[PDB]
């Protein structure tokens, strides 16, 4: 099956500066800002499409990682697309999960962060609702931590 999900986040922060933190300078900023993420590193590639990044994080007290493959990166248009290509544990019935993200101008010089998630499953399997809830919350917390960090570090 094929399933879509969307979420949106608002910030008082300007979109180009949020995108620099989230994407350009992600390998430095994300582990500083996000207290459950230990590291974000390039496993292979030059930063462009095809690049594989490894995000190491703690969950339930246990060290885990996930691998992200960069699918599109467009700084001019504040766009970044990636799919999950590996990690700890099993996908179970999840064949594929990709993300499409964009930042746009929001209220009073601020931003809106838009994320579209596309999940492909085996046959008639449905995406797990408890894991969806957890993912949704993680996304919220992630975007919020980045905002906190940038605010606490004017520039």
Ligand X SMILES: COc1ccc2[nH]cc(CCNC(C)=O)c2c1
Q: Which residues pair with 59 in a beta bridge?
A: 62
User: Could you give the string, one character per residue 123-152, with x where binding to Na ion holds by CB under 5 A and - elsewhere?
Assistant: ------------------------------
User: Could you give the string, one character per residue 35-74, with x where binding to Na ion holds by CB under 5 A and - elsewhere?
Assistant: --x-------------------------------------
Q: Which long-range contacts (CB under 8 A, 24 or more apart) does 46-50 make?
A: 47/73, 48/73, 49/73
**Near ligand X in 47-86, by CB under 6 A:** 55, 57, 66, 80
The reply, when asked if residue 80 is annotated as ligand binding, is yes
The CB density around residue 67, as the number of other CB atoms within 10 Å, is 16
Q: Of 57 and 150, which has the nearer Cβ to ligand X?
A: 57
The reply, when asked if residue 91 is annotated as ligand binding, is no
Q: Which residues contact 116 (CB under 8 A, 6 or more apart)?
A: 4, 5, 6, 99, 100, 101
List strand residue ranges (DSSP E) for 60-140, in order.
Answer: 62-74, 79-87, 94-105, 111-121
> Would you give the DSSP letter of residue 89?
S
Answer yes or no whether residue 31 interacts with Na ion by CB under 5 A.
Answer: yes
Q: Which stretch binds ligand X (CB under 6 A): 30-38, 43-51, 90-98, 124-132?
A: 30-38
Binding site for ligand X (CB under 6 A): 9, 22-23, 34, 36-37, 55, 57, 66, 80, 99, 101, 103, 113, 115, 138-139, 141-143
């Amino acid at each position: 099956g094929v399933f879509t999900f969307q979420d949106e986040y608002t910030s008082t922060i300007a979109p180009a500066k949020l995108y620099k933190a989230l994407v350009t300078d992600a390998d430095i900023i994300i582990p500083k800002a996000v207290e459950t993420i230990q590291s974000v590193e390039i496993v292979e590639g030059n930063g462009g499409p095809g690049t594989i990044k490894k995000l190491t994080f703690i969950e339930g007290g246990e060290s885990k990682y996930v691998l992200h493959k960069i699918e599109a990166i467009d700084e001019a248009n504040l766009g970044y697309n990636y799919s999950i290509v590996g990690g700890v544990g099993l996908p179970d019935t999840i064949e594929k999960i990709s993300f499409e993200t964009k930042l746009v101008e929001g209220a009073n010089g601020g931003s809106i962060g838009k994320v579209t998630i596309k999940i492909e499953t085996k046959g008639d399997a449905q995406p797990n609702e408890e894991e969806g809830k957890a993912a949704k919350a993680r996304g919220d917390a992630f975007f919020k931590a980045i905002e906190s960090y940038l605010s606490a570090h004017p520039d």
